[PDB]
Design a protein around this ligand. Structure first.
Ligand code: NI
Length: 341
């Protein structure tokens, strides 16, 4: 049964609610982004209308084989009418195709559902600026002040400079980057660009990337691993055993691996600056954990909410424990009292 925080009151609508069978009363199912916890339940047999971005719709059709007649893509930043209700999709600054959804209820209430997002000041000048929001369904993944991490730009600068240094010292070093979902493509694209290489990957991953409308992509990626010195592998293979085995397959072309695991937050964030990060090393293999986040830090989240001034906040992440829920409610009250709404 569908939980309350996936239902939009006063509408026939649900958000990210595909694993509950036929939801009673639901006339349109929205999907914020193509990550498995959110799409769980969709397949070629789904026969209700699915509303989403163009990029999410490319992925539904090509990866999950959802039939085209049930996919309803909407343009961003554009007032659209769905089953008699005005909606807008806004960029969530998460993975490719990820959106926030603004719903203009028939009774005058305005609701923003952030999906998964990384808040940014740039959102304070979208169509959110123009009216009041009464209810906020909020991505609270890192809603505690211990969650700090650098900007995406600082992290990419670190990775570029690290990869370029190592491969200029040793032209026989291979760079490997871990992946398990869409998102974080800038990591491996920026490294391949500094090295003058395409990114090599499996057919399945190349297919996924060909759905994302990235400009000039045919210029940046390939399935020919032998032509490439930046390879992508499954995240589960980014360990000493998995990397040793990969280096064997490369046929004496390389004699060293430098590998990257983009994680979200890890507790080495509470002590160490990005400039100071060091790898784990065994023999000719080094592994860097880099804190490239596609979710809001605590400070970014706070700033967005204090700017928006919602009347009510409904968390959509960390909702399963009373200690989490109680923590989050305390922070929302602090924020409200400090800013005065
Ligand atoms: Ni996500």
């Amino acid at each position: 049964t569908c939980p309350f925080y996936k239902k939009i009151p006063g509408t026939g609508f649900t958000v990210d609610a595909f694993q509950y069978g036929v939801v009673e009363g639901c006339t349109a199912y929205f999907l914020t982004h193509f990550h498995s916890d959110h799409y769980a339940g969709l397949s070629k047999h789904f026969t209700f209308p699915v509303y989403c971005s163009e990029i999410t719709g490319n992925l539904l059709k090509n990866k999950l084989h959802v039939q085209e007649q049930y996919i309803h893509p909407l343009p961003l930043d554009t007032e659209c009418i769905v089953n008699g209700v005005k909606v807008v999709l806004l960029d969530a600054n998460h993975c490719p195709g990820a959106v926030m959804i603004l719903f203009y209820l028939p009774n005058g209430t305005v609701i923003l559902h952030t999906g998964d997002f990384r808040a940014d000041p740039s959102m304070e000048r979208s169509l959110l600026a123009d009216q009041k929001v009464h209810m906020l369904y909020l991505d609270t993944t890192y809603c505690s002040p211990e969650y700090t991490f650098p900007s995406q730009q600082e992290v990419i600068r670190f990775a570029i400079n690290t990869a370029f240094e190592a491969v200029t010292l040793n032209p026989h070093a291979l760079v490997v980057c871990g992946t398990y979902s869409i998102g974080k493509e800038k990591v491996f694209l920026a490294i391949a660009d500094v090295l003058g290489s395409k990114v090599g990957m499996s057919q399945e991953k190349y297919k996924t990337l060909q759905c994302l409308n990235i400009p000039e992509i045919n210029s940046l990626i390939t399935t020919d691993m032998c032509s490439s010195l930046v390879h992508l592998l499954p995240m589960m293979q980014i360990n000493f055993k998995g990397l040793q085995s990969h280096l064997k397959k490369c046929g004496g072309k390389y004699n060293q691996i430098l590998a990257f695991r983009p994680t979200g937050w890890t507790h080495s964030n509470k002590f160490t600056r990005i400039a100071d990060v060091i790898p784990q090393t065994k023999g000719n293999i080094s592994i860097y954990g880099i804190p490239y986040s596609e979710h809001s830090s605590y400070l970014e989240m706070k700033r967005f909410v204090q700017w928006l001034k919602p009347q009510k906040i409904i968390p959509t992440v960390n909702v399963g424990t009373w200690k989490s829920r109680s923590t989050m409610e305390k922070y929302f009250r602090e924020w409200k009292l400090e800013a005065g709404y």
